[PDB]
Amino acid sequence: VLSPADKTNVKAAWGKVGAHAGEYGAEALERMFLSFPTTKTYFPHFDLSHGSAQVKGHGKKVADALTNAVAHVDDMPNALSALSDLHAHKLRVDPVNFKLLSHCLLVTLAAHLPAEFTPAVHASLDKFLASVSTVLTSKYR
Amino acid sequence: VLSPADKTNVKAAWGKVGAHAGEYGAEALERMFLSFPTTKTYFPHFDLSHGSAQVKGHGKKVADALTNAVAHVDDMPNALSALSDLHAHKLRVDPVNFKLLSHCLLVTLAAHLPAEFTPAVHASLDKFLASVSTVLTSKYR
Amino acid sequence: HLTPEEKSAVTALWGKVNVDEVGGEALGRLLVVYPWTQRFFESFGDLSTPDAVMGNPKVKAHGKKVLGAFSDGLAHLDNLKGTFATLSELHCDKLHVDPENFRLLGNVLVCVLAHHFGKEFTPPVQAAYQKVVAGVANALAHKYH
Amino acid sequence: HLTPEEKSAVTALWGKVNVDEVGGEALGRLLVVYPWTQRFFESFGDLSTPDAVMGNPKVKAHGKKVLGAFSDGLAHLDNLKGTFATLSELHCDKLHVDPENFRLLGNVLVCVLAHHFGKEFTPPVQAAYQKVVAGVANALAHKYH
Ligand code: HEM
Ligand code: HEM
Ligand code: HEM
Ligand code: HEM
Ligand SMILES: CC(C)(Oc1ccc(NC(=O)Nc2cc(Cl)cc(Cl)c2)cc1)C(=O)O
Ligand SMILES: CC(C)(Oc1ccc(NC(=O)Nc2cc(Cl)cc(Cl)c2)cc1)C(=O)O
Ligand SMILES: CC(C)(Oc1ccc(NC(=O)Nc2cc(Cl)cc(Cl)c2)cc1)C(=O)O
């Protein structure tokens, strides 16, 4: 579970992302597609090249969903209800891929937060992303 | 989450284990040690030879713990408190290994329950083992 | 790398397998136990309940093909890449199948072999088959990019 | 397998790495982010807070040792198995370390490189380092039995 300290840590780090949210979501996606090419199997309808509109647009959607999760950190299952439905019933992404994107999101944050990405904040962000991932796969079966 | 149907299926299937607790637990453990030899890194202090009394004794404890979890399907976090503490804070078994043991428990049940191991029951048992594993790793960080 | 004892065990057990039937059973259980895998099988019709999945003729027919390829792989345990290269390309380029699914199917197959053979599916025989299904998964994934 | 561009990217970045410092940071972060990894280091003293872990002289010393071996391996990317065979056997037979730990450490290292280098740690440079850390983990795991 996310401790008060975790929630404080996440809110501070994600708060520094701010308007860079969409950019960082797209970058994390690119990192994932390059580092873990099997994740591309979920996006055959995408042009996956660097700079592409579909990746930029999807990056903003992922980031905004994270912003929503942060805004409702005490009740993420409810806040993310439509999204967990969508992943369980339609998108049907294998759960391991959430670990891949989570890591790539951490790497992206690390690469953009030289000051904020302390060991304690790293730990809290990783817990947060695992929590989001758990909620997003909570209706799979 | 475990549905009423899952709970019914688990109770029906696990009820069939009965007096075979030590036997099935020890068999699942042996299946794990042989199939996934890295799991032996948690037991350097064990005699792991076939039919070793030590593996038999431990298999009994694991199986009895599962019998208790079945009895407490509606309050598994509370019921498994001591074991979740023990695995999180002392044993500190990497979470990946719970998937290995769960698979080997499922294989053991398949090998012993020809009548009971239908596709629906296979699904419910797998959900149950994942829920047990989730509870047992819930205190890790 | 199976040991020679393991290689002989795998072959012995496999001779007793009805590859057609076991294939439909493993594919059916994959779709029941991990229902998100149904995403790849929208053309198979009704998969809405366990009974519907297991009874579906397309599931049975496809399971035959899948396990046929598996069966042929068992003759080339030293060269699984050659057996699955063409299928790997198909699963990646044409079908867009996440290879993580190959692990799931392999473990379901191990469960089905356990269910079918009971005590004959001993812990050593299982260990041999775990090496086999991991090898098949790895070979089926090798042309991904 | 790293491509030639990837090998060049790995070498160039590693030229800027203070291996002692990065090793202590990576091992420290492993123990903070995944506290169960502390299980091997009960003799290191108090590891109960991030600051305690990170400033712990034994964590720093061991991180230096671990990343020193990692660093030496970067000179042998086409034979990581041979390079790490003796250490693999040791980690299995004497130290009893679950190889999952090598994978966790590898990803922590990637985070530490991203944190230290920022923009320079581009998505392609990350992909190269992901191949390296998986290769090292697989090499360290290879002699387990
Ligand atoms: C941090 C975890 C994730 C979050 C917060 C997230 C969020 C989202 C959001 C907000 C959407 C748009 C939903 C809509 O249109 O209403 C979406 C769609 C989608 N997601 Fe997830 N996602 C996550 C992880 C993943 C993973 C790991 C994958 C697979 C690699 C994935 C694959 C997809 C796909 C294929 C779509 C549809 C894309 C399209 O057709 O435009 N997502 N996700
Ligand atoms: C179904 C999941 C599991 C359950 C229900 C379970 C249950 C138990 C129980 C009841 C004990 C005895 C505790 C006592 O002495 O009071 C125990 C101990 C232990 N468990 Fe777990 N366990 C599970 C999974 C695992 C896994 C996956 C591993 C690592 C591969 C593991 C490693 C250990 C070890 C090393 C001990 C101490 C054994 C000894 O020194 O005697 N367990 N577990
Ligand atoms: C790992 C062992 C597997 C093997 C040996 C295998 C083999 C095969 C074979 C022989 C075909 C027929 C190809 C042809 O006739 O040209 C096929 C098609 C296909 N496979 Fe696999 N497969 C495996 C696993 C999977 C899994 C795990 C999935 C996804 C859950 C999958 C998804 C598909 C799909 C969607 C088709 C096309 C079916 C259609 O015609 O609509 N396969 N595979
Ligand atoms: C890149 C991955 C790693 C490499 C290259 C590496 C390398 C080494 C080396 C060179 C030694 C000294 C061996 C000797 O005495 O001859 C060592 C010892 C040791 N390592 Fe690893 N290591 C790695 C990861 C890990 C991880 C992730 C853990 C557990 C979290 C771990 C646990 C240990 C322990 C407990 C010792 C014994 C320490 C002592 O005797 O003071 N190692 N390792
Ligand atoms: C019980 C607890 C705390 O365990 C854990 C939580 C997170 C992780 N990290 C990972 O596995 N990362 C990870 C990252 C990549 Cl790129 C690939 C893969 Cl395959 C895995 C490990 C264990 C949990 O699940 O919340
Ligand atoms: C969301 C949901 C339902 O997803 C899943 C639940 C279970 C599994 N099975 C596995 O991974 N088995 C598994 C088995 C072995 Cl031997 C090794 C490894 Cl590495 C994995 C996969 C996904 C969950 O987590 O509850
Ligand atoms: C045969 C068997 C059991 O092997 C394995 C099962 C799980 C793992 N763990 C992971 O990959 N962890 C992992 C962890 C991180 Cl942080 C990063 C990455 Cl990239 C991977 C390794 C091998 C299987 O595949 O079922």
From Swiss-Prot, chains A, B:
Effect the entry attributes to changing residue 19 to E: In J-Tashikuergan
Q: What is the effect of changing residue 136 to P?
A: In Bibba; unstable; causes alpha-thalassemia
Tell me which residues bind O2.
58
Outcome of swapping residue 92 to W: In Cemenelum; O(2) affinity up
Q: What is the effect of changing residue 2 to R?
A: In ChongQing; O(2) affinity up
Q: What is the effect of changing residue 27 to V?
A: In Spanish town
**Effect ascribed to mutating residue 131 to P:** In Questembert; highly unstable; causes alpha-thalassemia
Outcome recorded upon mutating residue 9 to T: In Broomfield
Q: Which domain of life is it from?
A: Eukaryota
UniProt modified residues of type N6-succinyllysine: 7, 11, 16, 40
Q: What is the effect of changing residue 62 to M?
A: In Evans; unstable
Indicate the impact reported for residue 53 to D.
Answer: In J-Rovigo; unstable
Query: In UniProt terms, what is the effect of altering residue 87 to R?
Result: In Iwata; unstable
Chain positions with N6-acetyllysine modification? 16
- Which chain positions carry the site (Not glycated)? 11, 56, 60, 90, 99
Name positions with the PTM Phosphoserine: 3, 35, 49, 102, 124, 131, 138
Q: Beyond the main fields, what else does the record say?
A: Gives blood its red color.
Protein's UniProt name:
Hemoglobin subunit alpha
Q: What is the lineage of its organism?
A: Eukaryota, Metazoa, Chordata, Craniata, Vertebrata
Curated annotation (Swiss-Prot), chains C, D:
Q: Which sequence positions carry the modification called Phosphoserine? A: 8, 43
Identify the CDD domains for this entry.
Hb-beta-like
Q: What is the effect of changing residue 95 to V?
A: In Regina; O(2) affinity up
What does altering residue 65 to T do? In Chico; O(2) affinity down
List each coiled-coil range.
none
Consequence the record notes for mutating residue 133 to E: In North Shore-Caracas; unstable
What results from changing residue 116 to P?
In Saitama; unstable
Ranges of residues in domain Globin:
1-145
Name it: Hemoglobin subunit beta
